[PDB]
Design a protein around this ligand. Sequence first.
Ligand SMILES: Nc1ncnc2c1ncn2[C@@H]1O[C@H](COP(=O)(O)OP(=O)(O)OP(=O)(O)O)[C@@H](O)[C@H]1O
Ligand SMILES: [Cl-]
Ligand SMILES: [Mg+2]
Ligand SMILES: [Mg+2]
Length: 261
Amino acid sequence: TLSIPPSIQCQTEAACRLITRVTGDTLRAIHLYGSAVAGGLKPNSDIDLLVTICQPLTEAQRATLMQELLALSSPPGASAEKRALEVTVVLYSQLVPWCFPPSREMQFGEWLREDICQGIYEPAQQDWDMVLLITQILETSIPLKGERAERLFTPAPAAQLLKALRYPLDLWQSTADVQGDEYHIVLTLARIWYTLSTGRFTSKDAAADWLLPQLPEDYAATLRAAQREYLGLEQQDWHILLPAVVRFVDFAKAHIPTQFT
Ligand SMILES: Nc1ncnc2c1ncn2[C@@H]1O[C@H](COP(=O)(O)OP(=O)(O)OP(=O)(O)O)[C@@H](O)[C@H]1O
Ligand SMILES: [Cl-]
Ligand SMILES: [Mg+2]
Ligand SMILES: [Mg+2]
């Protein structure tokens, strides 16, 4: 059975207790997933949590949850003992049976700290990534509360998983679309490519390793720089590298499979 890294156990139990208390009667399950469970937990890595609830959260619960999580989470890399939390909240009725795309009730994350610390909360909204989240959780997750994933959710049809995997390819078309987030986008494309070719999910680092031998050397060099930075082995000047990142994004759009291999 999958294990929680000892070094995040205390904070993970604190998040679970806070979520449980605030949601109360409406809570159906809490699952830990992502690199803490699947592998590749780096110093900057967040703690990924999915919260399944039965009824929508009141305007008051949402505010309580957001403000409290703010105090349970720290910006990534700030502390080795207090990681960034990502908490995604979803109605059970959006997943069983599936709505495509599913909506998420709310998402807490450090990239939203400046808004969340002012009381500005993203509202419920459609999110194709929820299909990827549940698919990943069905394979690799730990139920902190409620039932194990394979007993709670059902897999999405392959056709919808395909649409969800390819949807972010339209997010990146311009230079400004990718500027500021360069290595993240390069590694995500590597993972998307990996999943479409194998049907499987793997870490950012392993996805880069898998893709590198299949690339012309110019594109492997960009992927290598992105992997290197993510592993903390070298910080590049990504303004200088931006034109090559745009070429890499275009190369992935041209070459990533359009159907599962
Ligand atoms: N093919 C894919 N495989 C995995 N994640 C993918 C893929 N395509 C898109 N993603 C999305 O990218 C995000 C990855 O989340 P996250 O950054 O927490 O990754 P991680 O594996 O936990 O690594 P880290 O340790 O850097 O947090 C999720 O929203 C996930 O659904
Ligand atoms: Cl690890
Ligand atoms: Mg993560
Ligand atoms: Mg995350």
